[PDB]
Amino acid sequence: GHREEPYLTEAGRDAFDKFCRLHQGELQLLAGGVLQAPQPVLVKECELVKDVLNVLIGVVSATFSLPESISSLLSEVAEYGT
């Protein structure tokens, strides 16, 4: 056996997140320092759920002060707690 070198559209959860930071770096190069969009990591899933459910109680957190599309998904429920 010598398998079919993971076709892209099926191989994710590491290779897609690697891949997100690749297209992010590409856009940053096409801008050239004038974009500089970091933090393509961090953290986990369940603790983020307890975090956002805590935001509904008014609570402050590590990312709530007072890929990369989770900021938009997070704003939709952040403005609920405000």
Binding site: K50, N54, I57, V59
Partner: protein
């Protein structure tokens, strides 16, 4: 999160001092009875925390779970602390500490949870007068 939970701790220390101070002879006949009726409400506040501690022995308790459990005690000790400070700040002895409790019974009339606590304290404080 513990900053949100600590108001019931602050509303406990200002109740035990009121009962410890107004159990002295100089405070008449009725302010004795007002500090008398609050201690059956101190008993339940302790019983919840001992039951939560014995539950915490089994590891089946969380900080969010505890904050869910103590929600009635946060209200009941707050009404007792409000009555405690209202009797202390304006000096209320005898009939004057019988008027203020009748006022708070009219303040809470539609909740029926804080009314019943306050109406219990009125009938208990009205016994000597």
């Amino acid at each position: 999160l513990v900053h949100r939970i600590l108001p019931v701790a602050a509303s406990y220390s200002a109740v035990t001092r009121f009962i410890e101070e107004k159990s002295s002879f100089e405070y008449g006949q009725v302010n004795h009875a007002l500090a008398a009726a609050m201690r059956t409400l101190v008993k339940e506040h302790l019983i919840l925390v001992s039951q939560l501690e014995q539950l915490h022995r089994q590891g089946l308790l969380s900080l969010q779970k505890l904050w869910f459990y103590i929600q009635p005690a946060m209200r009941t000790m707050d009404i007792l602390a409000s009555l405690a400070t209202s009797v202390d700040k304006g000096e209320c002895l005898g009939g004057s500490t019988l008027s203020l409790l009748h006022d708070r019974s009219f303040s809470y009339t539609g909740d029926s949870q804080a009314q019943e606590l306050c109406l219990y304290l009125t009938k208990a404080a009205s016994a000597p007068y």
